């Protein structure tokens, strides 16, 4: 599956030729290199290891350094991922942004924004109690279980706790524009993560 | 009326769609005469 490690620059909008506005998210692609390969007869499966923006030479541990010993003029890469079942490339290669030039839809994977310790009403769209008529119940859970049967709280009951921070992959984002000179992709819609967080863009499954 | 959209491919073909058969399994499936590309649902051909 064709994929790339990009950085979510932000959002903007563009004007189609006839006047229709399209709200887009912009992704900037630092150069991506193929660092190694995984093979079915040696690792158990076939995948390509892909890496991106470099690290500072004072903060590269020697295991990471030795990972790149045999590669020529490829500094250590901070973001490393795997592309399963891909061919057409080998160690030392380098993937342009134009691999999406023939693609209509993409999928983007990133780390969603963190919202801290969040309550039930925000986390699960719980309604609350009334704010008047004598109510002493505003944004609490309400009841949680049943009385004596089962005499416990079922596993998976939704309560308060941390919100957000998980990975998530959003599907079928239309591809609006590709700009090779500035290494940018413009997709239509929202992309998980805060500004400057790093996403992975894959060719759409459908 | 917003004029009845002519059921067209993205490759300029009509999507006539038909019914393959194979091994008890009856299949309705999409077809373009311009490009002969076979899929099932004309979603995939706009």
């Amino acid at each position: 599956m064709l994929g790339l490690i990009g950085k979510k620059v932000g959002m903007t909008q563009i004007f189609q030729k006839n006047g229709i506005v399209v709200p887009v998210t912009v992704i900037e692609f630092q150069p991506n290199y193929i660092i190694g390969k995984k093979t079915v007869d040696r690792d158990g499966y076939s995948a390509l290891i892909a890496g991106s923006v470099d690290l500072k030479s004072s903060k590269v541990s020697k295991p990471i350094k030795g990972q790149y010993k045999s590669l020529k003029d490829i500094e250590p890469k901070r973001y490393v991922i795997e592309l399963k079942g891909l061919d057409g490339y080998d160690a030392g290669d380098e993937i342009k942004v134009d691999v999406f030039k023939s693609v209509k839809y993409v999928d983007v994977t990133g780390t969603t924004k963190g919202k801290g310790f969040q309550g039930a009403m925000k986390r699960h769209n719980f309604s609350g109690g009334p704010s008047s008529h004598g109510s002493k119940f505003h944004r609490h859970l309400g009841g949680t279980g049943q009385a004596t049967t089962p005499a416990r709280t079922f596993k998976g009951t939704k309560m308060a706790g941390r919100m957000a921070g998980n990975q998530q992959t959003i599907q079928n984002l239309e591809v609006v524009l590709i700009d090779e000179e500035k290494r940018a992709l413009l997709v239509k819609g929202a992309v998980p993560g805060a500004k400057g967080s790093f996403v992975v863009v894959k060719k759409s499954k459908k | 009326r917003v004029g009845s959209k002519e059921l067209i491919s993205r490759w300029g073909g009509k999507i006539i769609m038909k019914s393959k058969f194979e091994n008890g399994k009856i299949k309705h499936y999409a077809e373009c005469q311009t490009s002969k590309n076979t899929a099932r649902k004309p979603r995939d051909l706009f």
């Binding site: 909008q13 006047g19 229709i20 506005v21 | 009326r1 917003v2």
Partner: protein, 122 residues
């Protein structure tokens, strides 16, 4: 964003002057109607001795809203009062003339005759 209990100006010459929305059609929990939707109204005030009496229930189409709704080209049109037009059984305007402007989403919602009888389309 017309919901239930909203007051509306009847913008045609049937006789009614104020209507109240009592249902938003087409949807189970549907809560808001926009320009070009059909609602069920009760008449709360009418011109005396007219063909429309106070307290009758009809279907009406929304022609002006006071909350702006996005269009494809990015433009938003926000009127200054909420107004509707009464319809007969065929989902066609019961009246013969329409007062004031209307919004052009009636064009897309296929109310061409309301659009024509309007004075200005914005």
């Amino acid at each position: 964003m017309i919901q239930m209990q909203t007051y509306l100006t009847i913008a045609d010459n049937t006789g009614g002057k104020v209507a109240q929305c009592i249902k938003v059609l087409g949807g189970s929990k549907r809560r808001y109607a926009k320009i070009g939707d059909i609602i069920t109204i009760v008449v709360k005030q009418a011109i005396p001795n007219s063909s429309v009496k106070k307290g009758d229930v009809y279907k009406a189409v929304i022609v002006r809203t006071s909350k702006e709704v996005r269009r494809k080209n990015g433009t938003y049109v926000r009127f200054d009062d909420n107004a509707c037009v009464i319809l007969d059984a065929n989902l066609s305007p019961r009246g013969k003339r329409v007062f004031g402007p209307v919004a052009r989403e009636l064009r897309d919602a296929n109310f061409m005759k309301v659009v024509s009888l309007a004075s200005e389309v914005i």
